[PDB]
Amino acid sequence: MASLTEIEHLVQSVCKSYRETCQLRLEDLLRQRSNIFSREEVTGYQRKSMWEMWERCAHHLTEAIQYVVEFAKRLSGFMELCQNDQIVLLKAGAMEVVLVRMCRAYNADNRTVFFEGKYGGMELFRALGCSELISSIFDFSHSLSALHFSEDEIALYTALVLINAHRPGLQEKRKVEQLQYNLELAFHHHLCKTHRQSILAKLPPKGKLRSLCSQHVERLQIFQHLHPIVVQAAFPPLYKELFSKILHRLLQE
Numbered sequence: 001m002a003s004l005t006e007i008e009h010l011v012q013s014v015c016k017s018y019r020e021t022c023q024l025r026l027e028d029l030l031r032q033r034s035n036i037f038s039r040e041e042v043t044g045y046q047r048k049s050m051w052e053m054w055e056r057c058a059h060h061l062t063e064a065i066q067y068v069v070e071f072a073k074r075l076s077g078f079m080e081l082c083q084n085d086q087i088v089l090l091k092a093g094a095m096e097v098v099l100v101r102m103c104r105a106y107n108a109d110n111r112t113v114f115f116e117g118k119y120g121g122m123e124l125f126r127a128l129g130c131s132e133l134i135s136s137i138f139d140f141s142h143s144l145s146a147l148h149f150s151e152d153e154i155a156l157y158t159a160l161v162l163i164n165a166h167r168p169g170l171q172e173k174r175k176v177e178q179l180q181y182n183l184e185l186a187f188h189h190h191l192c193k194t195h196r197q198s199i200l201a202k203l204p205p206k207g208k209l210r211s212l213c214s215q216h217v218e219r220l221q222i223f224q225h226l227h228p229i230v231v232q233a234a235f236p237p238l239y240k241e242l243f244s245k246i247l248h249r250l251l252q253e
């Protein structure tokens, strides 16, 4: 099942599907690395209330997950799976896909990230009262930056993050397994061709992405307990769905 030419076609289809669905262009992100938030603007973010910061960030996370949903829909084999499985995959892998994609908006020279139009370090998010979570996200982004990923590599890697046959609650496990294998062949074939099989040992352990997503759900339950109405009234429906039937509607478009 799937010859040499079919693997090279899958490689190119995955690389195309990814370029079409990344929220921010790498060119644009790079042509902005100098637009850094001033000490005053940073103090402004630091002084904003916890609920204000949480709402802005949940809104930003929602926009990203939305482009990730569009990646999955454009991804070969995904829309052929049943609705239950498509939802199991996104509910579990969307956040993880955003966690990989965020390395493109990160600068390892000055340890900053792109946020609301400019770059700023960890201290920008002090008002969230996360600390450990913000550190973890920054460390994760730092470790992926070390890998010097090409766009095709993030494409192939993120497709595999999402197409996970081990996700609890899969109705047609074999059908996901076949797709994951094809995507594994494609990824490794591309790594082999480009002489980049080196990164294989250096890719993050599968439990690291799980740890980050878990910390997110734990820091949210803490916030939701202190500001329940802020979450019901000002948090996005799709965010509440994944982390607290938008998916069924987004997938049917």
Ligand SMILES: O=C(O)[C@H]1CC[C@H](C(=O)N2CC[C@@]3(S(=O)(=O)c4ccc(F)cc4)c4ccc(C(F)(C(F)(F)F)C(F)(F)F)cc4CC[C@@H]23)CC1
Pocket: 021, 022, 023, 024, 025, 054, 057, 058, 060, 061, 064, 067, 098, 099, 101, 102, 103, 104, 105, 113, 114, 115, 125, 128, 130, 133, 134, 137, 138, 216, 219
């Ligand atoms: O091109 C693309 O598709 C990319 C472009 C970059 C995008 C991106 O970096 N991101 C999407 C939004 C953003 S961010 O830019 O707002 C950001 C926030 C905190 C950071 F430390 C670093 C970046 C985000 C938003 C909220 C959370 C939270 F988990 C938490 F707690 F950390 F704040 C939560 F609030 F939701 F809980 C995490 C993240 C990490 C990935 C970041 C992802 C999509």
